[PDB]
Amino acid sequence: YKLICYYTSWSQYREGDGSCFPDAIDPFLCTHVIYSFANISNNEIDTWEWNDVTLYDTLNTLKNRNPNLKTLLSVGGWNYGSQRFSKIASKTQSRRTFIKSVPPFLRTHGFDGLDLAWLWPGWRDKRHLTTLVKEMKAEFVREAQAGTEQLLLSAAVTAGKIAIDRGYDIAQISRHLDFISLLTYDFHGAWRQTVGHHSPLFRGNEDASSRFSNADYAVSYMLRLGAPANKLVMGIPTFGRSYTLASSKTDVGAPISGPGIPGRFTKWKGILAYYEICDFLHGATTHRFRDQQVPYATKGNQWVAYDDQESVKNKARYLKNRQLAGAMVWALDLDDFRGTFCGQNLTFPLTSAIKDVLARV
Numbered sequence: 590y591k592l593i594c595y596y597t598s599w600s601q602y603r604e605g606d607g608s609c610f611p612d613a614i615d616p617f618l619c620t621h622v623i624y625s626f627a628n629i630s631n632n633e634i635d636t637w638e639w640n641d642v643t644l645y646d647t648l649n650t651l652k653n654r655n656p657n658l659k660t661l662l663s664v665g666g667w668n669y670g671s672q673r674f675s676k677i678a679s680k681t682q683s684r685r686t687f688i689k690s691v692p693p694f695l696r697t698h699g700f701d702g703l704d705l706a707w708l709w710p711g712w713r714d715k716r717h718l719t720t721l722v723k724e725m726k727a728e729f730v731r732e733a734q735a736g737t738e739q740l741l742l743s744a745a746v747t748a749g750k751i752a753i754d755r756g757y758d759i760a761q762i763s764r765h766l767d768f769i770s771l772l773t774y775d776f777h778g779a780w781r782q783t784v785g786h787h788s789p790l791f792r793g794n795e796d797a798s799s800r801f802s803n804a805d806y807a808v809s810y811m812l813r814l815g816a817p818a819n820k821l822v823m824g825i826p827t828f829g830r831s832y833t834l835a836s837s838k839t840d841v842g843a844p845i846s847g848p849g850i851p852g853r854f855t856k857w858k859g860i861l862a863y864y865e866i867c868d869f870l871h872g873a874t875t876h877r878f879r880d881q882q883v884p885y886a887t888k889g890n891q892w893v894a895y896d897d898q899e900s901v902k903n904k905a906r907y908l909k910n911r912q913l914a915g916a917m918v919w920a921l922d923l924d925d926f927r928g929t930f931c932g933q934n935l936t937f938p939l940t941s942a943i944k945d946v947l948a949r950v
């Protein structure tokens with residue numbers, strides 16, 4: 590089984606214990622660790638923060654303790670113009686420059702592959718994403734002739750049906766990608782004016798217009814579209830989404846004034862790290878959607894949709910039952926990486942739980 594874990598650049602700036610460096614990563618935890626994100630500059634892949642060169646170095650040393658560990662660098666990501674990738678990919682002179690520049694960069698800093706996190710192409714962009722993936726793989730193949738182990742190429746593909754249809758030629762790209770991480774955790778957000786869970790695993794017959802907004806449907810859809818199971822990776826979140834409530838209505842369908850207040854460490858409206866959620870649970874009322882199989886907690890006028898060890902294990906069994914390639918975690922730095930907030934004196938509770946299901950019968 591594969592266990593793809595993202596590590597985020599900006600998590601070094603969080604104060605106190607919230608601060609996370611490659612250092613904190615247990616090298617035998619995941620099979621692949623992906624670093625997010627890289628920039629594109631002068632049509633070439635390039636670093637993002639000032640000190641990336643040093644963190645790349647810290648992260649890649651983990652490989653001294655575990656030689657079977659593969660690491661990848663991710664270009665793109667949400668706080669990066671979708672328009673910017675579209676510009677690079679539609680013009681042939683720009684795309685080849687981007688492509689030619691990647692193997693050198695990855696070899697210098699010691700990465701084993703590239704991850705395309707273009708989020709996300711509109712309908713005019715679909716043929717260009719395909720070309721990007723095809724020509725990039727071809728470059729990775731040509732570069733391997735020099736005697737090095739072939740660079741890996743993966744992509745983070747969104748999970749909403751409409752998003753997939755609009756801009757991904759899933760049957761085409763699967764032939765060339767090594768794995769595809771399915772972002773099965775953005776099924777709800779402040780944008781809806783009601784409370785709801787962002788990563789239900791199953792349909793759950795409470796609402797019947799979004800029969801498409803759960804990991805189960807997304808995985809089936811990707812499979813019907815031609816993505817082989819041994820290349821598909823299910824994304825499991827390690828964060829929670831919060832909402833400020835606009836009444837005392839706390840049940841399914843309750844109304845919303847907007848995102849929840851920020852957490853002490855992550856400082857981001859509508860998001861909480863699992864370690865912040867462990868602190869939040871004290872004096873909160875836990876609840877759990879039985880059909881959808883995921884929990885939510887609420888306290889005061891805050892309402893939080895999140896994942897715990899039971900839900901994450903359940904999702905893990907699901908992927909195994911459908912014989913998928915593995916699980917993908919976003920992100921190691923929102924998990925209880927020190928292991929001192931969530932009770933048990935275990936570190937990376939959520940990720941170790943996922944691994945437990947993947948490592949057994």
Ligand SMILES: CC(=O)N[C@@H]1[C@@H](O)[C@H](O[C@@H]2O[C@H](CO)[C@@H](O[C@@H]3O[C@H](CO)[C@@H](O[C@@H]4O[C@H](CO)[C@@H](O[C@@H]5O[C@H](CO)[C@@H](O)[C@H](O)[C@H]5NC(C)=O)[C@H](O)[C@H]4NC(C)=O)[C@H](O)[C@H]3NC(C)=O)[C@H](O)[C@H]2NC(C)=O)[C@@H](CO)O[C@H]1O
Nearest residue numbers: 599602626638666667668669706745772828856857860919
């Ligand atoms: C696989 C996949 O595709 N997954 C997606 C994923 O996109 C989704 O997660 C979200 O992604 C975006 C980025 O794409 C994240 O946005 C974060 O937001 C951070 C906090 O608000 C912000 O942190 C700031 O980072 C700055 C660096 O750009 C820091 O500036 C630095 O300040 C330092 C002192 O503090 C100083 O020393 C540095 O020199 C200075 N350097 C700079 C500016 O480079 C800043 O301090 C820091 N702190 C603040 C302001 O709070 C990040 O910059 C920003 N990222 C990027 C790349 O810009 C967002 O947080 C992600 N969300 C979550 C929940 O993790 C994800 C969720 O859905 O999964 C998939 O969808």
Ligand SMILES: *[C@@H]1O[C@H](CO)[C@@H](O)[C@H](O)[C@H]1NC(C)=O
Nearest residue numbers: 628629630631632636637638
């Ligand atoms: C990344 O590249 C852009 C465009 O080339 C450049 O203007 C910018 O300074 C870089 N952005 C960051 C956040 O480092």
